[PDB]
Write a protein that binds this DNA or RNA. Structure first.
Ligand SMILES: [K+]
Ligand SMILES: [K+]
Ligand SMILES: [K+]
Ligand SMILES: [K+]
Ligand SMILES: [K+]
Ligand SMILES: [K+]
Ligand SMILES: [K+]
Ligand SMILES: [Mg+2]
Ligand SMILES: [Mg+2]
Ligand SMILES: [Mg+2]
Ligand SMILES: [Mg+2]
Ligand SMILES: [Mg+2]
Ligand SMILES: [Mg+2]
Ligand SMILES: [Mg+2]
Ligand SMILES: [Mg+2]
Ligand SMILES: [Mg+2]
Ligand SMILES: [Mg+2]
Ligand SMILES: [Mg+2]
Ligand SMILES: [Mg+2]
Ligand SMILES: [Mg+2]
Ligand SMILES: [Mg+2]
Ligand SMILES: [Mg+2]
Ligand SMILES: [Mg+2]
Ligand SMILES: [Mg+2]
Ligand SMILES: [Mg+2]
Ligand SMILES: [Zn+2]
Lengths: 84, 60, 115, 59, 183, 177
RNA sequence: CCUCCUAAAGAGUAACGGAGGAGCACGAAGGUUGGCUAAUCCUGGUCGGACAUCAGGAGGUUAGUGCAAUGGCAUAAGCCA
RNA sequence: GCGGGGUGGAGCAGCCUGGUAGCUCGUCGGGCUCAUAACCCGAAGGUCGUCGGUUCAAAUCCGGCCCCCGCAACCA
RNA sequence: AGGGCUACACACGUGCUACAAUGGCGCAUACAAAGAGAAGCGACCUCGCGAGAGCAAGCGGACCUCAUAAAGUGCGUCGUAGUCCGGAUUGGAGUCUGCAACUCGACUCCAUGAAGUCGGAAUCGCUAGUAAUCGUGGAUCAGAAUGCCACGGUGAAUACGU
């Protein structure tokens, strides 16, 4: 994982959007393509729609999701199974 | 009790590492050395996060 | 020869014997024997009861056996409930750390299921 | 009636083809409608919709 | 009949023309509610014309029924049987794309490659309608993988689609239909 | 008799206060403790039942009675009369001594003991639990455990309800969770 | 040959009338003395599961009788010594 | 009326005498071959026509029902 | 920009690692060749269990660095077990590169400890410094080899014959 000396990674655009949403208390889902941004503690309580490659899957952030990347909660490959 | 059909049942000393010594009748002939007992077992004695991790580790 | 709720082998050397505890490997075994001041090459049978008590005291400073098992189970459960990619891989019994899945992965997928 | 159907069935032969799949020229042409694709792989993959819809429209 | 269709055509034209002015008002007044209102009218009218088109397409009697697709190899031989296997794969995949359900009732496989024949059951809305035009003989031209010289060979395979007819109701004889003579 | 004397000297008074019993005869009393070691696999071999009987004898201090099938059952391929287990009933001083051993030595040796379920009461005040490995009793020798044998322990009590049963067992410092 | 109905409240009573069994078994499955009481279901309990064995409860012969059916059977004719 | 049958995809066993499903082909996987067959090495597939009974337990014993076979169906 | 090219009931090809004692582990101690290096190789020293980090020599090199070769040898232990064999898998904690390691990098530490006990029909390479086995370097390359290309160490068996 990313070195602890570097600090956690978040795309500045998403950080600004999260700050604005928290301050304004808005409840509209925030669409993002930044699957690589970490889930910060401030994010908890917000609905963030992470791009799965073809759509933005809605994700309601909880406390257990802190530290994981947003992409870990938006599967990109769909597999019904062979001989379904 | 019917005689001659039951196991031999005599008193022995059982000592746990904590210190308790109990003099109890048992079938085993020798004295017992206990690694644990009710006096010292963690349950009997009663001796038996993500946000915190992020905050502390990252120091943002 | 009973430590952490289980019996350890007695005819083995102590360093190998302590590894029988779930949660203790060679490194932790060397550490335990060192902190207890007992040679790693002495068989468990050839120990006084006080030495075994010191060994138990040393083992107490780690997480072993059922405590460790329930921690591991809780972590796996947490992932599976979070619904993270790792958790979904755990649910479906596929490799979790990004290994290939078309040719290999027999250890996770189990024995072959013929069509 | 089944025999009449079996006798109306066209022979599987040189004269009659509803559609031609020339895979050395990457051409697929339906003789009835005229729809002619060049991505033969899509039609092999199941992209028959162009030809099928053209036929239904031409009724 | 004549009226109904003619009226629908006239109303479609006039209603589209009307939606044009309504959309103009939407944008002009910059009323987002009126823009959504115009969208609503247009969406419904679009679906209406699509219904008319559906009735034009699937005008056959049994077009709504589930269908059976039979593929039989012809003049190519080994090459034709391979071509039939290719056609089977193509049709099955198209069925998946359309969402229909497929089953293989019977399949006579080729001695060296491909299939001599295959019967596939297609279950779905208007399956016979969607697959009926595919019935015919399909010609294939490729360098034959079964000819040592790699010559360009032509092979033929046939697809026949027939609807799933309901089983005929068996009828017993009305005693009034019989004359019994004893002698 | 440490535990029996403890009953008569502490548990009686505590339970009298807790349930406001008018008479000492109304206080719950441990009637008996039954240990059962039903061995299904003895159908194939008789010596398995004999060895299990020896184990139950060492744990109990008594010779066990060999229980046999009440009726033939196809599913387990048993005919009526074939021996499918061994039981011991402990009453009096032997019972109280076993209760002391179970509470103070064996239950501590239960692998990963996190607490016995208080839901296990039968609905009439009795309590049944299960032991997975006879090794938890010090009498059995780990150097000779040919097979992992278990058993079940039933403490049958005069208490008229589960609440009184749990109160009596708890007053005996039974390690519930 | 045995059991029930037909058979009309004593016995008996026919039909190519309606339903089933027997052509044995047991030196204990006989005698006596002493003792005991079922089916089934529910709850709790190691493996153990719909169903083995253990504990309690409900129930009260709905069991059992070596084998058909009927009539009996708790003082048991049922079960154990 | 009296006899038989109905068991992996096909043909036959197993029933009698209750506990247990077999053989040959066929199917599937891997070989051999330029390739197919043949051949070689491995696998899978029947809860026993359908219900019911009896039994601790049924392909098996009993009774219906369905299908298939035989015979018999006369003096008249 | 995000995703995919890395999917996964399954079949095949080519590899690596093993199933141990001619071995595993621990300590000690010998003997190479070939090559690369400036947005590079990076010594030393200090910190860290470690991957690494900080500071900082030298070297466009027969000069400095990568960079102790390993098998071997000596001593000790294991004593035959799914093991002190094997190291897949998984949990936790980290490092480095890189805007950015979720899909989908490599490496480290602690824990875990799967199959596997020499592999059916069949089939492959090799005639000598070869096979077998043991290390080393390079390109590609920010990072990312069991692949490929190259280099040395030890070092066989057998060829009657057509
Ligand atoms: K993968
Ligand atoms: K009568
Ligand atoms: K008697
Ligand atoms: K490889
Ligand atoms: K990655
Ligand atoms: K191991
Ligand atoms: K590199
Ligand atoms: Mg990888
Ligand atoms: Mg009368
Ligand atoms: Mg009368
Ligand atoms: Mg008369
Ligand atoms: Mg008369
Ligand atoms: Mg009698
Ligand atoms: Mg009597
Ligand atoms: Mg009698
Ligand atoms: Mg059977
Ligand atoms: Mg690729
Ligand atoms: Mg090892
Ligand atoms: Mg380099
Ligand atoms: Mg390790
Ligand atoms: Mg194995
Ligand atoms: Mg071995
Ligand atoms: Mg040569
Ligand atoms: Mg090498
Ligand atoms: Mg070499
Ligand atoms: Zn103690």
């Amino acid at each position: 994982p990313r070195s602890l000396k570097k600090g956690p990674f978040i795309d500045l655009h998403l950080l600004k959007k999260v700050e604005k949403a928290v301050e304004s208390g808005d409840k509209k889902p925030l669409r993002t393509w930044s699957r690589r941004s970490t889930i910060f503690p401030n994010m908890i309580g917000l609905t963030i729609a992470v791009h799965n490659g073809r759509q933005h899957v809605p994700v309601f952030v909880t406390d257990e999701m802190v530290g994981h990347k947003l992409g870990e909660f938006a599967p990109t490959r769909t597999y019904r199974g062979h001989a379904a | 009790m019917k005689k001659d059909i039951h196991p031999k049942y005599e008193e022995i000393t059982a000592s746990c590492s904590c210190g308790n010594v109990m003099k109890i009748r048992s079938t085993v002939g020798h004295d017992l050395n206990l690694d644990v007992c009710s006096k010292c077992h963690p349950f009997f004695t009663g001796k038996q996060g993500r946000v915190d991790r992020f905050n502390k580790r990252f120091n943002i | 020869a009973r430590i952490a709720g289980i019996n350890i082998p007695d005819h083995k050397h102590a360093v190998i014997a302590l590894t029988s505890i779930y949660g203790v490997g060679k490194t932790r075994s060397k550490a335990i024997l060192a902190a207890a001041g007992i040679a790693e090459d002495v068989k468990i049978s050839e120990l006084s009861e006080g030495q075994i008590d010191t060994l138990r005291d040393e083992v107490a400073k780690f997480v072993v056996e059922g405590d460790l098992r329930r921690e591991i189970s809780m972590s796996i459960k947490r992932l599976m409930d979070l619904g993270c990619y790792r958790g979904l891989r755990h649910r479906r019994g596929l490799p979790v750390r990004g290994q290939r899945t078309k040719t290999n992965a027999r250890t996770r997928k189990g024995p072959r299921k013929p069509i | 009636e089944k025999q009449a159907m079996e006798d109306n069935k066209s022979d599987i032969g040189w004269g009659s083809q509803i559609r031609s799949y020339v895979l050395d020229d990457s051409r697929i042409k339906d003789l009835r409608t005229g729809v002619e694709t060049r991505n033969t792989q899509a039609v092999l993959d199941g992209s028959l919709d162009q030809f099928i819809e053209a036929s239904l429209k031409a009724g | 009949s004549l009226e109904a269709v003619v009226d629908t055509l006239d109303q479609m034209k006039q209603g589209l023309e009307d939606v044009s002015g309504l959309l103009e008002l939407a944008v002009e007044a910059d009323d987002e509610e009126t823009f959504n209102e115009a969208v609503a009218e247009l969406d419904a009218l679009e679906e209406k014309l699509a219904q008319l088109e559906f009735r034009r397409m699937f005008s056959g009697e049994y077009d709504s029924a589930d269908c059976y697709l039979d593929i039989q190899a012809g003049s190519g031989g080994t090459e034709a049987q391979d071509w039939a296997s290719m056609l089977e794969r193509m049709y099955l995949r198209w069925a998946e794309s359309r969402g229909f359900k497929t089953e293989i009732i019977k399949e006579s496989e080729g001695e060296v490659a491909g299939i001599k024949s295959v019967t596939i059951k297609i279950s779905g809305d208007y399956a016979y309608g969607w697959l009926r035009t595919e019935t015919g003989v399909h010609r294939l031209v490729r360098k034959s993988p079964f000819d040592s010289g790699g010559r360009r060979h032509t092979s033929f395979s046939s697809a026949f689609v027939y609807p799933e007819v309901d089983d005929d109701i068996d009828i017993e004889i009305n005693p009034a239909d019989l004359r019994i003579d004893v002698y | 008799a440490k535990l029996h004397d403890y009953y008569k000297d502490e548990v009686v008074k505590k339970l009298m206060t807790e349930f406001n019993y008018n008479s000492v005869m109304q206080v719950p009393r441990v009637e008996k403790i039954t240990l059962n070691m039903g061995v299904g696999e003895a159908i194939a071999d008789k010596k398995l039942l004999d060895n299990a009987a020896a184990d139950l004898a060492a744990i109990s201090g008594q010779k066990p009675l060999i229980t046999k099938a009440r009726k033939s059952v196809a599913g387990f391929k048993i005919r009526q009369g074939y021996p499918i287990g061994c039981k011991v009933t402990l009453r009096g001083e032997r019972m109280w001594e076993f209760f002391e051993r179970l509470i103070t030595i064996a239950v501590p040796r239960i692998r990963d003991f996190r607490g016995l379920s208080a839901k296990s009461f039968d609905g009439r005040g009795n309590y049944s639990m299960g032991v997975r490995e006879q090794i938890i009793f010090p009498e059995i020798d780990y150097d000779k455990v040919d097979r992992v044998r278990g058993l079940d322990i039933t403490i049958t009590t005069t208490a008229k309800s589960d609440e009184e049963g749990r109160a009596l067992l708890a007053a005996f410092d039974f390690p519930f969770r």
